[PDB]
C-alpha cells in the first residue's frame, strides 16, 4: 500500500511529459550548474599527447514539469528513470575517447526534489588531448586542459555555471594521482565562449598544471654521458708512445656514446626540433669525437716534431676539461631557471 | 505555450514513413555538407592511414517537417534522429570510425520552419591513404577522405559542399609533430559502380614531412662515424694494432647504428631513400678498412709505394664522399 503511493507519483510525473523539449522552451535560458570530483588523475602519455582522468561528473538544473508533493521530499530514483526525462547533452570538446562505466549497472544517479531541482551525476573516464611543447624536455611543464559544454544547445538556450566558487568546484581526491613521472602542482577553473559554424556556445574549462620529474634522466642519461666524456679526456694522460692504447681508448668511447645515444632516443617522443636532451647528447658526442681527432694530430707530429706534440697534448689536458665545465654551467643555468 | 510545441512535434512524427526518402519518386533531395576538422593525428606509415576527428554537418530540405506558428529553430533532443530520415552517407576508405557517446551520443537535430533539417555528428575516423615512401624521409603525401552515398544513386540524392571552398574549416589550426599541411582541396564528382552512379565528395590534404628531426639522429651519426674512419690514414702504416682496431670498430659502430635505427624507423619492407644512404656510408667504412690491408700487405716489400697510397687516400676518400652526397642530395631534393 505504502509502496504504491510512490508508484502513482512516478506515473503522474511522466504523464503528459515530453523529453524532446528542454525546460522553459521559448521562455528562458536553462541554467545547468556543474561541478567535478576527480577521483584519480591518470597517466599522461608523451607520445600520444593525451592524458586520462576519472571524474564524478555532477550536473544540476530545474524543471517545472516534475514538481510534486508527497510523503518524501527527495526521490532517490534509479538510472532507469533518467532516460524518460530531459538531460543536458554535455560533451567534452577535447575528448579523444571517453567511457561511461556501467558495471555492474549504469553508474548514474538521479534525485528529484519537491521544487523540481534535479541532480544527475555519473562516473566517467575521460581521455583528453593535451598538446605539449617539448623544447625543454625533460625539464618541461605543461597545462593540460579539459573543456566541456553543450553540443546542440547554444548560449541562447543552455548556459553552464559552476556550482560553487570556481576554485572550489573541481575537487581532486587526495589519493587520486596516478602520475609516475609528473607532479600535479594545481589546477585552475575558468569559463569561456566558443563560436562554431552553428552558433555561440558556452564552454567550461579546467587546466591541470604539471611539471616533469627529471630524477630518472639524471641517473640514466645525463650521468653516463658525463662520465663517458670525462673518460675520453683520460686519454690525454697516457703517454704518446702507446699508440694502440690511445686509439682503442679513443674509438671505444665513441662506440659507448653511440650506444648511450641510441638508448636515450627511445624515451624521446617523435618531434621535429631539438629538445634540451638532444643538445646535451649532441654536445657530449662532439667531445668524444674531438678527443680522437686530437690524438691523430698528436700522433702525426710525433717522431718528427716532438716539441709541438707534447705542447698540443699538454694544453689539451686543460682546454677540454675547462670547456666542458663551462658548457655545464651555461646549460644547467639556461633550462633550470625557467 | 510549451504544450503547443509538443502538439506540433507530435503532428509531424505522426504518419512519418521513415522508409521513404524526401521527394520519393520526384526530384532528388540535395544534401549539403560542412566539415569542421577538430584534429589530425597518428599519421602512421606502418599501417598507411591517419586518424581524423571532425564535426560533420548535413543539410537537406524535407517538406513533411514544415511547421507554422512557431518563430523558432527547434533544436530537438538528439534521440529524435531515430524517428526521421537521414542520408546513408559513408566514407569509402574508412577503416574504423565511431560517433562519440559521452556523456550522450554526440548528435544534433535542428529543425527550421520551412522544413530544412540540420544534422550534425562528431565522428572520429581512421581513413586509409597509400604512401609512396620510396623517398622517405624527404617525401610528400596526399591523404584524402572520400564521402559517398551507399544505397541511393544520382537519380535519388545529390551532394554538394555548402559555401564552396569554405565548407571545410579548421585546417589552419592543425599542427602535426612530423608533417606540415600544405594545401587542402574539395572535389565533387560521380563514381559509376556495378549498381549505378553514386555521388561523391572528396577532401584531400597534402602533407610535406618536416626534415630537421632525422638530421640529429639519422644522418649526422652516420656521417660522423664515416669521418672517423678517415683518421686511419694519418696513422703510421706499421701501427697494425692501431689501424685495425680503429678500422674494424667503426664497422661495428656503423652496424650498431643501422640495426638500432632499423628498429626505431617504421617497418616499411622495401627500399627507401634512407636505406640507400646508410648502405652508402657502410661501403665507405668498409673500403677504408680494406684499403689498409692492401697497404699492410706491401708496406714491407715496397715501403715507398705504400706511403703513396696513404697520401692519396687522404684526398680520394673525402672527395668521393662529398661527391656521393652531392649526387644523393640533389637526386632526392
Amino acid at each position, epitope marked *: 500500500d505504502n509502496t504504491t503511493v510512490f508508484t502513482r507519483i512516478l506515473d503522474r510525473l511522466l504523464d503528459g511529459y515530453d523529453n524532446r523539449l528542454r525546460p522553459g522552451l521559448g521562455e528562458r535560458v536553462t541554467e545547468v550548474k556543474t561541478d567535478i570530483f576527480v577521483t584519480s588523475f591518470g597517466p599522461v602519455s608523451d607520445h600520444d599527447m593525451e592524458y586520462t582522468i576519472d571524474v564524478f561528473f555532477r550536473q544540476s538544473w530545474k524543471d517545472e514539469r516534475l514538481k510534486f508533493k508527497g510523503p518524501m521530499t527527495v526521490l532517490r530514483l534509479n538510472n532507469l528513470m533518467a532516460s524518460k526525462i530531459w538531460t543536458p547533452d554535455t560533451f567534452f570538446h577535447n575528448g579523444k575517447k571517453s567511457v561511461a562505466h556501467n558495471m555492474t549497472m549504469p553508474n548514474k544517479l538521479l534525485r528529484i526534489t519537491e521544487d523540481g531541482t534535479l541532480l544527475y551525476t555519473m562516473r566517467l573516464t575521460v581521455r583528453a588531448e593535451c598538446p605539449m611543447h617539448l623544447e625543454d624536455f625533460p625539464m618541461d611543464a605543461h597545462a593540460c586542459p579539459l573543456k566541456f559544454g553543450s553540443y546542440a544547445y547554444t548560449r541562447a538556450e543552455v548556459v553552464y555555471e559552476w556550482t560553487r566558487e570556481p576554485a572550489r568546484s573541481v575537487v581532486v581526491a587526495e589519493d587520486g594521482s596516478r602520475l609516475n613521472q609528473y607532479d600535479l602542482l594545481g589546477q585552475t577553473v575558468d569559463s569561456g565562449i566558443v563560436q562554431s559554424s552553428t552558433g555561440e556556445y558556452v564552454v567550461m574549462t579546467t587546466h591541470f598544471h604539471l611539471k616533469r620529474k627529471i630524477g630518472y634522466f639524471v641517473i640514466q642519461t645525463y650521468l653516463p654521458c658525463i662520465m663517458t666524456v670525462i673518460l675520453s679526456q683520460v686519454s690525454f694522460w697516457l703517454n704518446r708512445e702507446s699508440v694502440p692504447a690511445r686509439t682503442v681508448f679513443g674509438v671505444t668511447t665513441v662506440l659507448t656514446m653511440t650506444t648511450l645515444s641510441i638508448s636515450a632516443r627511445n624515451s624521446l617522443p617523435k618531434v621535429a626540433y631539438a629538445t634540451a636532451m638532444d643538445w646535451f647528447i649532441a654536445v657530449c658526442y662532439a667531445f668524444v669525437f674531438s678527443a680522437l681527432i686530437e690524438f691523430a694530430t698528436v700522433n702525426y707530429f710525433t717522431k718528427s716534431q716532438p716539441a709541438r706534440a707534447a705542447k698540443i697534448d699538454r694544453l689539451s689536458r686543460i682546454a677540454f676539461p675547462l670547456l666542458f665545465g663551462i658548457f655545464n654551467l651555461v646549460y644547467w643555468a639556461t633550462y633550470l631557471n625557467r | 505555450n510549451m504544450s503547443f510545441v509538443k502538439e506540433t512535434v507530435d503532428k509531424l512524427l505522426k504518419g512519418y514513413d521513415i522508409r521513404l526518402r524526401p521527394d520519393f519518386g520526384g526530384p532528388p533531395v540535395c544534401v549539403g555538407m560542412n566539415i569542421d576538422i577538430a584534429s589530425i593525428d597518428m599519421v602512421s606509415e606502418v599501417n598507411m592511414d591517419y586518424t581524423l576527428t571532425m564535426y560533420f554537418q548535413q543539410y537537406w530540405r524535407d517538406k513533411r517537417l514544415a511547421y507554422s506558428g512557431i518563430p523558432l529553430n527547434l533544436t530537438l533532443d538528439n534521440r529524435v534522429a531515430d524517428q526521421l530520415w537521414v542520408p546513408d552517407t559513408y566514407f569509402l576508405n574508412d577503416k574504423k570510425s565511431f560517433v562519440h557517446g559521452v556523456t550522450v551520443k554526440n548528435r544534433m537535430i535542428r529543425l527550421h520552419p520551412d522544413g530544412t533539417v540540420l544534422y550534425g555528428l562528431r565522428i572520429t575516423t581512421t581513413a586509409a591513404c597509400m604512401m609512396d615512401l620510396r623517398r622517405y624521409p624527404l617525401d610528400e603525401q596526399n591523404c584524402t577522405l572520400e564521402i559517398e552515398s551507399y544505397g541511393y544513386t544520382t537519380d535519388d540524392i545529390e551532394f554538394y559542399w555548402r559555401g564552396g571552398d569554405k565548407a571545410v574549416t579548421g585546417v589552419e589550426r592543425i*599542427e602535426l609533430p612530423q608533417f606540415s599541411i600544405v594545401e587542402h582541396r574539395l572535389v565533387s564528382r560521380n563514381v559509376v559502380f556495378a549498381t549505378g552512379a553514386y555521388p561523391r565528395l572528396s577532401l584531400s590534404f597534402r602533407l610535406k614531412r618536416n626534415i630537421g628531426y632525422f638530421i640529429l639522429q639519422t644522418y649526422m651519426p652516420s656521417i660522423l662515424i664515416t669521418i672517423l674512419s678517415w683518421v686511419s690514414f694519418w696513422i703510421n702504416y706499421d701501427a697494425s694494432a692501431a689501424r685495425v682496431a680503429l678500422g674494424i670498430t667503426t664497422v661495428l659502430t656503423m652496424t650498431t647504428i643501422n640495426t638500432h635505427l632499423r628498429e626505431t624507423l617504421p617497418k616499411i619492407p622495401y627500399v627507401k631513400a634512407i636505406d640507400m644512404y646508410l648502405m652508402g656510408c657502410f661501403v665507405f667504412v668498409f673500403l677504408a678498412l680494406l684499403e689498409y690491408a692492401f697497404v699492410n700487405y706491401i708496406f714491407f716489400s715496397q715501403p715507398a709505394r705504400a706511403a703513396a697510397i696513404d697520401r692519396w687516400s687522404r684526398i680520394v676518400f673525402p672527395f668521393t664522399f662529398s661527391l656521393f652526397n652531392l649526387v644523393y642530395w640533389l637526386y632526392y631534393v
Partner: nanobody
Amino acid sequence: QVQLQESGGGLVQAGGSLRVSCAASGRTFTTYIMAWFRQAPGKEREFLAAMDQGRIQYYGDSVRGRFTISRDYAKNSVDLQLDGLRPEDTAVYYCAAGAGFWGLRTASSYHYWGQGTQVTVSS
C-alpha cells in the same frame, strides 16, 4: 628573434569602434595562447581577452560584451575589436603569447610581449 608587432589605436570621441591588431613573426603560434592586456598609467597591467588553439574565448569582467578578440591563424595574428570606448579605457594595450601555465589570466605566464599601443579616449 620572435617579434610581436602591433598596430591600430588612436583617438576616439567617447565611443565608436577602434580595432587594435597584432602581428607575430619568427615562430608559429598555432599551439599557443594569444591574449590582450591593458596597462593604465600607474595602476597595473590588466587582463582583457585571450583565445587558445580551440577558439575558446576568455574575457575580463569589465570588458565582457564590449571587446571581441579574433585570431587569424593563417597570418599568425590576433585582433581585438574595441567598441563603446569609455574615457576610463585610456591606457596602453599589449599583445602577449604564452602557454598559459599557472592560469591564462596571469601576466607572468606569457614568455612573449608586444611593445604596446597607446589608445586615448576623449570624453
